[PDB]
């Protein structure tokens, strides 16, 4: 996260850390959407241009974390992967369309003050909240700048950006499965996701039932906190069908 702030303890209890066994290291952000399922971005697991194709056995899931590098004894919980599920039409070749994957855990994680799942939007919450100017919150342990690593979970609030502005900011072909977020050069304030934040949650708090919803998954950007450029997020409601398919058929 760039120009973000230190997370309060318990502020993001759905935040998950994709962790690399050997060599031990942060792979990506992710989120907890139930006691056995974790949501993340597809490119965190599969990205052939970079020679990335992880399997379950390669990874660990670390839930309830605050500190980036520290092993938070009695607080965090580390889960083993049972199965990985990548969207069958994930477009790593062109624009990262449909950048989303599910990770079924080996054993149920136990909730606590530090561990708790976020909601997934229904059509009516998406329609009410996915609006230019409405702000969301993205979190993660990624770089503090484009060119470093934070000591604790970073937090930043960012306004959803108008689709024409999103499109006019880039040469990449953008889709309905994406939205962009970030301030304009105009708006003075700044901030963005960055490398390592990938697969992490863009959440909003519904003013209707006071619950936090994950609207977006950190997907891509051209640089980090670049003036006139925006963060791009997987549109989770647009792929909710796929998500409950996967969950409705594999337990």
């Amino acid at each position: 996260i760039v120009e973000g702030s230190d997370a309060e303890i318990g502020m993001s209890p759905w935040q998950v850390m994709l962790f690399r066994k050997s060599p031990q290291e942060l792979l990506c952000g992710a989120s907890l959407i139930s006691d056995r399922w974790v949501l993340t971005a597809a490119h965190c697991l599969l990205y052939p241009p970079w020679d990335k194709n992880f399997t379950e056995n390669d990874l660990l899931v670390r839930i309830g974390k605050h500190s980036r590098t520290r092993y938070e004894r009695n607080i965090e919980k580390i889960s083993m992967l049972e199965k990985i599920y990548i969207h069958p039409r994930y477009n790593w070749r062109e624009n990262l369309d449909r950048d989303i994957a599910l990770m079924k855990l080996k054993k149920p994680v136990a909730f606590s003050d530090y561990i708790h799942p976020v909601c997934l939007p229904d059509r009516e919450t998406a329609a009410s909240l996915l609006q230019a100017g409405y702000k969301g919150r993205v979190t993660g342990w990624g770089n503090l700048k484009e060119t470093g690593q934070p000591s604790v979970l970073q937090v930043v609030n960012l306004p959803i950006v108008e689709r024409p502005v999103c499109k006019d900011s880039t040469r990449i072909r953008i889709t309905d499965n994406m939205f962009c977020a970030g301030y304009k050069p105009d708006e003075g304030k700044r901030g963005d996701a960055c490398e390592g934040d990938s697969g992490g949650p863009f959440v909003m708090k519904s003013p209707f039932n006071n619950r936090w919803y994950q609207m977006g998954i950190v997907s891509w950007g051209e640089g980090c906190d670049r003036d006139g450029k925006y963060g791009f997020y997987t549109h989770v409601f647009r792929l909710k069908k796929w998500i409950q398919k996967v969950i409705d058929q594999f337990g």
Partner: peptide, 28 residues
């Protein structure tokens, strides 16, 4: 699940974190 989106250390205790009101005030 169904207790989803409600954080133990904030919503369950009716505490706010320091910037959620920035979100609220944008939901205009």
């Amino acid at each position: 699940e169904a207790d989803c989106g409600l954080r133990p250390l904030f919503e369950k205790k009716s505490l706010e974190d320091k910037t959620e009101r920035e979100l609220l005030e944008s939901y205009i």
